[PDB]
């Protein structure tokens, strides 16, 4: 079963990637890779996982500018939803 996670990151770059996938009618965003030293791993975030939100404001209600935007600010917040670990 896959858990919901909240994430908080403060600064460059929070070293990680996202991918983009509408198919089932709703936006969904995924984490593509992640620098294993970087800012996001470090706080426990994994290839793989679904971002459901960017600073409060769920995948579907994001577009590129805001996305952008967000991820130059000094910090940032994620809710994300992933597998535990095994």
Do not use: C, W
Not at 7 to 15: L, M, N, S, W
Not at 24 to 29: A, E, N, P, S, Y
Not at 64 to 85: H, W
């Amino acid at each position: 079963g896959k858990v919901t996670h909240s994430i908080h990151i403060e600064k460059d770059t929070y070293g990680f990637s996202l991918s983009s996938v509408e198919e089932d009618g709703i936006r969904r965003l995924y984490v593509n890779s992640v620098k294993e030293t970087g800012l996001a791993s470090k706080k426990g975030l994994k290839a793989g996982d679904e971002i459901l939100e960017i600073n409060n404001r769920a995948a579907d209600a994001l577009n590129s500018s805001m996305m952008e935007d967000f991820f130059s600010q000094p910090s940032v917040g994620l809710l994300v939803r992933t597998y535990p670990e095994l």
